[PDB]
């Protein structure tokens, strides 16, 4: 029974090793909006007689 206690304690230490890590790479990334219409700024001004 004492040996079973000792062996189990050593096994727990051996299981404390770390396998790897995982993370998400997202810094520097932004979302894009979509502009539907082209912003023209032209207006036509004409005289009443059409001259």
């Amino acid at each position: 029974e004492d040996m079973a206690k000792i062996y189990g304690a050593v096994a727990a230490v051996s299981k404390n090793v770390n396998s790897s890590v995982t993370y998400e790479v997202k810094r520097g990334t932004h979302e894009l909006i979509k502009v539907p219409t082209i912003p023209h700024n032209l207006v036509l001004i004409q005289s009443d007689n059409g001259k």
């Binding site: 004492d2 000792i6 050593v10």
Partner: protein, 50 residues
């Protein structure tokens, strides 16, 4: 100045014999625990570093 002579009663003598049995068991128990702890340290822990 008032030293008292020691009287070894039969009840006292038997009490010592009971203590010898309990002392012997305690020493044997301690020896087993020390041996178990020494085995555990060697298998589980290595040396320390700065």
């Amino acid at each position: 100045f008032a030293l008292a002579q020691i009287n070894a009663d039969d009840e006292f003598i038997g009490a010592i014999d009971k203590e010898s049995a309990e002392y012997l068991d305690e020493y044997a128990t301690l020896a087993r625990d020390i041996s178990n702890s020494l085995t555990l340290v060697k298998a589980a822990f290595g040396p320390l570093e700065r």
